[PDB]
Write an enzyme that holds these catalytic residues in place. Sequence first.
Site, PDB file in Angstrom:
ATOM      1  N   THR A 118       0.825  -1.330  -0.058  1.00  0.00           N
ATOM      2  CA  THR A 118       0.049  -0.044  -0.043  1.00  0.00           C
ATOM      3  C   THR A 118       0.849   1.091   0.175  1.00  0.00           C
ATOM      4  O   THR A 118       0.697   2.272  -0.946  1.00  0.00           O
ATOM      5  CB  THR A 118      -1.098  -0.190   1.175  1.00  0.00           C
ATOM      6  OG1 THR A 118      -0.113  -0.028   2.322  1.00  0.00           O
ATOM      7  CG2 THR A 118      -2.058  -1.085   1.138  1.00  0.00           C
ATOM      8  N   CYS A 125      -7.428   2.129   9.264  1.00  0.00           N
ATOM      9  CA  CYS A 125      -6.039   1.745   9.254  1.00  0.00           C
ATOM     10  C   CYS A 125      -5.147   2.442  10.357  1.00  0.00           C
ATOM     11  O   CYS A 125      -5.108   3.483  10.625  1.00  0.00           O
ATOM     12  CB  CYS A 125      -5.208   2.305   7.811  1.00  0.00           C
ATOM     13  SG  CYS A 125      -3.341   2.048   7.911  1.00  0.00           S
ATOM     14  N   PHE A 134      -8.040   4.859   3.763  1.00  0.00           N
ATOM     15  CA  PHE A 134      -7.454   4.324   5.026  1.00  0.00           C
ATOM     16  C   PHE A 134      -8.729   3.655   5.670  1.00  0.00           C
ATOM     17  O   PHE A 134      -8.586   3.302   6.842  1.00  0.00           O
ATOM     18  CB  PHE A 134      -6.908   5.177   6.014  1.00  0.00           C
ATOM     19  CG  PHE A 134      -5.413   5.489   5.325  1.00  0.00           C
ATOM     20  CD1 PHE A 134      -4.558   4.906   5.231  1.00  0.00           C
ATOM     21  CD2 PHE A 134      -5.586   7.005   4.980  1.00  0.00           C
ATOM     22  CE1 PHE A 134      -3.337   5.413   4.519  1.00  0.00           C
ATOM     23  CE2 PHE A 134      -4.221   7.604   4.586  1.00  0.00           C
ATOM     24  CZ  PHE A 134      -3.438   6.630   4.290  1.00  0.00           C
TER      25      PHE A 134
HETATM   26  C1  HEM Z   1      -0.110   4.263   2.518  1.00  0.00           C
HETATM   27  C2  HEM Z   1      -0.915   3.049   2.278  1.00  0.00           C
HETATM   28  C3  HEM Z   1      -1.927   2.326   3.317  1.00  0.00           C
HETATM   29  C4  HEM Z   1      -3.093   2.211   2.920  1.00  0.00           C
HETATM   30  C5  HEM Z   1      -3.902   2.928   1.571  1.00  0.00           C
HETATM   31  C6  HEM Z   1      -3.857   1.609   3.871  1.00  0.00           C
HETATM   32  C7  HEM Z   1      -5.187   1.020   3.766  1.00  0.00           C
HETATM   33  C8  HEM Z   1      -5.823   0.419   4.890  1.00  0.00           C
HETATM   34  C9  HEM Z   1      -7.412   0.152   4.862  1.00  0.00           C
HETATM   35  C10 HEM Z   1      -8.236   0.667   3.710  1.00  0.00           C
HETATM   36  C11 HEM Z   1      -7.646  -0.557   5.773  1.00  0.00           C
HETATM   37  C12 HEM Z   1      -8.872  -1.150   6.216  1.00  0.00           C
HETATM   38  C13 HEM Z   1      -8.903  -2.436   5.581  1.00  0.00           C
HETATM   39  C14 HEM Z   1     -10.413  -3.114   5.940  1.00  0.00           C
HETATM   40  O1  HEM Z   1     -11.401  -2.383   6.454  1.00  0.00           O
HETATM   41  O2  HEM Z   1     -10.562  -4.381   5.625  1.00  0.00           O
HETATM   42  C15 HEM Z   1      -6.305  -0.724   6.705  1.00  0.00           C
HETATM   43  C16 HEM Z   1      -6.248  -1.543   7.751  1.00  0.00           C
HETATM   44  C17 HEM Z   1      -5.027  -1.811   8.396  1.00  0.00           C
HETATM   45  N1  HEM Z   1      -3.780  -1.282   8.148  1.00  0.00           N
HETATM   46 FE1  HEM Z   1      -3.240   0.250   6.597  1.00  0.00          FE
HETATM   47  N2  HEM Z   1      -2.850   1.201   4.592  1.00  0.00           N
HETATM   48  C18 HEM Z   1      -1.716   1.674   4.450  1.00  0.00           C
HETATM   49  C19 HEM Z   1      -0.682   1.412   5.131  1.00  0.00           C
HETATM   50  C20 HEM Z   1      -0.412   0.724   6.529  1.00  0.00           C
HETATM   51  C21 HEM Z   1       0.776   0.609   7.232  1.00  0.00           C
HETATM   52  C22 HEM Z   1       2.151   1.651   6.997  1.00  0.00           C
HETATM   53  C23 HEM Z   1       0.582  -0.218   8.210  1.00  0.00           C
HETATM   54  C24 HEM Z   1       1.259  -0.574   9.481  1.00  0.00           C
HETATM   55  C25 HEM Z   1       2.585   0.005   9.800  1.00  0.00           C
HETATM   56  C26 HEM Z   1      -0.830  -0.712   7.996  1.00  0.00           C
HETATM   57  C27 HEM Z   1      -1.597  -1.429   8.862  1.00  0.00           C
HETATM   58  C28 HEM Z   1      -2.743  -1.873   9.012  1.00  0.00           C
HETATM   59  C29 HEM Z   1      -3.432  -2.532  10.104  1.00  0.00           C
HETATM   60  C30 HEM Z   1      -3.029  -3.183  11.137  1.00  0.00           C
HETATM   61  C31 HEM Z   1      -4.914  -2.479   9.796  1.00  0.00           C
HETATM   62  C32 HEM Z   1      -5.996  -3.228  10.365  1.00  0.00           C
HETATM   63  C33 HEM Z   1      -6.468  -2.177  11.421  1.00  0.00           C
HETATM   64  C34 HEM Z   1      -7.724  -2.811  12.361  1.00  0.00           C
HETATM   65  O3  HEM Z   1      -8.552  -3.324  11.673  1.00  0.00           O
HETATM   66  O4  HEM Z   1      -7.712  -2.477  13.408  1.00  0.00           O
HETATM   67  N3  HEM Z   1      -1.408  -0.004   6.825  1.00  0.00           N
HETATM   68  N4  HEM Z   1      -5.214  -0.135   6.146  1.00  0.00           N
END
Ligand code: HEM
EC number: 1.14.14.1
Lengths: 451, 452
Positions: free
Chosen positions: B265, B397, B390
């Site tokens: 991502t 996120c 996000f």
């Molecule tokens: C820069 C681009 C990024 C995008 C576009 C992005 C996007 C997303 C999205 C849309 C979700 C929700 C997915 C869902 O509802 O099923 C999510 C969840 C998550 N992302 Fe990101 N993310 C990015 C970077 C990161 C980074 C750098 C990390 C870790 C250092 C990360 C860790 C996580 C985690 C752990 C979740 C789950 C949160 C939860 O449900 O408690 N992501 N992300």
Amino acid sequence: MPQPKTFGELKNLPLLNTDKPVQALMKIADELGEIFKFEAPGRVTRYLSSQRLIKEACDESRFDKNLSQALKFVRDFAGDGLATSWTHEKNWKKAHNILLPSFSQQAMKGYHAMMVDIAVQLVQKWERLNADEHIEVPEDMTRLTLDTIGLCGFNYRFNSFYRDQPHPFITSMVRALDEAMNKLQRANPDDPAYDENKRQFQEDIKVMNDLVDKIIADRKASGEQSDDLLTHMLNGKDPETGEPLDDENIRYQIITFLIAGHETTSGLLSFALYFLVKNPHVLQKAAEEAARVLVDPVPSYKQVKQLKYVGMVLNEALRLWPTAPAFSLYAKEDTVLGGEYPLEKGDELMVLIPQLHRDKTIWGDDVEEFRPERFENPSAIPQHAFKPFGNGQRACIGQQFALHEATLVLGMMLKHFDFEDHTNYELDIKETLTLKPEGFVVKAKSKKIPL
Amino acid sequence: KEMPQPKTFGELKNLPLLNTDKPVQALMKIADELGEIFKFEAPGRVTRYLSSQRLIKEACDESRFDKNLSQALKFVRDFAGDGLATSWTHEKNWKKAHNILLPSFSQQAMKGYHAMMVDIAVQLVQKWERLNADEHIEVPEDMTRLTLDTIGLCGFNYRFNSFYRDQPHPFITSMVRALDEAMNKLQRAPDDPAYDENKRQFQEDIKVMNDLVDKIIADRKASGEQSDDLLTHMLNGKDPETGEPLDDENIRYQIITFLIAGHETTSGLLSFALYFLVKNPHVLQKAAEEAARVLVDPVPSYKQVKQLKYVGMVLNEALRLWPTAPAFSLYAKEDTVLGGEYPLEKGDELMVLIPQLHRDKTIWGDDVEEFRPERFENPSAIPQHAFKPFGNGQRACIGQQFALHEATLVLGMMLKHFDFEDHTNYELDIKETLTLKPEGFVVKAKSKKIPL
Ligand code: HEM
Ligand code: HEM
């Protein structure tokens, strides 16, 4: 420890001889930092402004609630009600145990109908204004919070929206509070010029006592059961001691609910509306939610819980201008605060809440901007960084009551009217024991949505 | 009332529509034809794809809808376990890890990771400084080297050393191959013997990931050392609610999750950002001016990164057009009506098609396909739930602040140190796995000779 400028034998005390003492203390905190000593004849305290130190001050194993001089003067008519009692007084824990279930979130279901009653009166008043008439916001908000607490507290109608001069109980309470507040910065109190103040003070105490004692006696004689706190107190028993509250303490609790709740809650609504009209994009977000959620002529308890963004708006208003702006603590034993400040048993602390809520290490660099999105996910907020309702077992028992009423009222206001800051109002925060935007006025254009 | 639905394939219903190399772009084209909502049926599964802010703002009502695990997330869960991204909201380990990890992912917590992010960013700049004349940059390849190593360092203080390799560290190879298999399973028509090797390789890659991460956790516990990484915070953290810490197995799954969820991502964001910059020279010049004005020190500080306002707008506009986590899934907690015309029964599923949401003309105007970072000059003007790269709510996120600080720092340094040339007149070709990226995107970088 840093300390502001002194006035010879009076030490720092004349710094508080101003009409805006909290804002003055905030400016001192800006200059001196997270902690400064404040000395007066016969009294030393320390003002805390950082989350780093306040999280230690909120350790209930190390610090207990202290009665500030303001609270000490209020106790002369609030008695040993919850807000002006020491934790070690039998009547605090007794009333705390009895009253906590009647202030829970679940208990708000039972007060909702009475809250709607007064809220609809507010909406009806604004619907009935003529063109180019305007709204006096904190004045109407105080009408609304007083009547709501009176109705939910002991089923009494002050009928503030039928009056220019409030019900005599309200006049006496406000004047008693004013005298209590004025005593804080009063030199030579035993001078004959204040004889009239003392006579008036005793008169207002009797006015408050007589009315509430009469209602308590009336309720006992009738035997009737209402959905108010008075009924809960007449029927409640402390699970610990097995004892009920006696009639005198019940009167002091009723007086306390009105004192502690009416101006704090009305200031919150007033500050909320101020920030909304000063931030039109945020108002549009809040107005959209109210229109989408409040689809019925009268809001339900369930619908109020759905006003998530309105709740965020209120929390951000509480962040910038917490309407109960300070509370006091004392050290239970000798202890070291922050690893560098030694404290002796009994040493006093003040938590300067508006400064705490501007801690850049917690909130970032934009602390003065109104952004409800700070509260989009409450779990992101660190512990003891946001304390508009105090701390621990001595926290505000009315927190759920206050936020439920304010969420309901602000939601209905945003549902039924568009608001105009027609004077380009300049924020002027009047200080009593609470904070409010003095002279805040708006024009409301009705959306013609029936009730 | 009657919900639109794309063309069907007899008993297979709509499912063969997803048997394509670019399924998100296919779904976007269906949304163009059918509108803000269409039903998508497959054997044993029905869902609804949402594309309008009008409906998605209701879908983001957490009182009415909760996060659902898509089939993609279900396949990822086989090696991501009950980490944050592949766990249900009602699982004890989600709320526990959510409460423990949220303070370690705050904006303020980025101050503690900034130095390790700079470490990897300086390696990237040094690689590009050391290219010979007329050599070129493989943009998504280097960005993925940059984000993987940054997450490894900030996550558990481990150096994959991706810039020293053509073949990545075996953990990365196993992780990337496990993700590819999880993605390939989506359109695999599965128990056939041809896939026996795929299954054997899958379990082998899981063992590679588990063994390395379990070893680092065990090493850290035995040493007792304290670093500025997420692993230390997880070894010492306690859920304020339950009073419990994460156990070692869930900690391993969180580390695996940070690499899975964050690496592609974030590298895709940087790659799309640079793509739009070289395709819009006036915007590139504006962003390069800001980088030169703000980054006055040989190494950027945390405070300076926050001052890169226009760079932040550039990244948000890139996230608007091509959000690199392009969808998320929801289910109805109870019977509810969506938009006042579509009745939903308890358990009914929704998909939020983020790239289509970000092209809602009622929100953004008629020029939704144009790259204009100035759309984000005042974020507060954007209506609620209109910009969701996000995710939403408590299931949003957790790495948003990490990702944006990383991308802003790196893009700022790239714009400070080099002029960029679109030397092949690159034609956008968006490769789809579980994320999106501009495949084959290459540029030439001419150094400005500014030392580090
Ligand atoms: C820069 C681009 C990024 C995008 C576009 C992005 C996007 C997303 C999205 C849309 C979700 C929700 C997915 C869902 O509802 O099923 C999510 C969840 C998550 N992302 Fe990101 N993310 C990015 C970077 C990161 C980074 C750098 C990390 C870790 C250092 C990360 C860790 C996580 C985690 C752990 C979740 C789950 C949160 C939860 O449900 O408690 N992501 N992300
Ligand atoms: C919405 C604005 C309100 C604010 C900002 C507020 C704030 C506070 C604060 C800061 C304290 C602790 C003071 C100290 O530690 O000395 C407190 C205590 C208290 N408040 Fe409130 N309050 C509000 C509304 C209300 C309402 C509506 C009620 C009653 C219905 C109420 C009743 C009380 C009581 C009884 C206490 C004493 C609790 C105890 O010590 O056992 N407050 N409040």
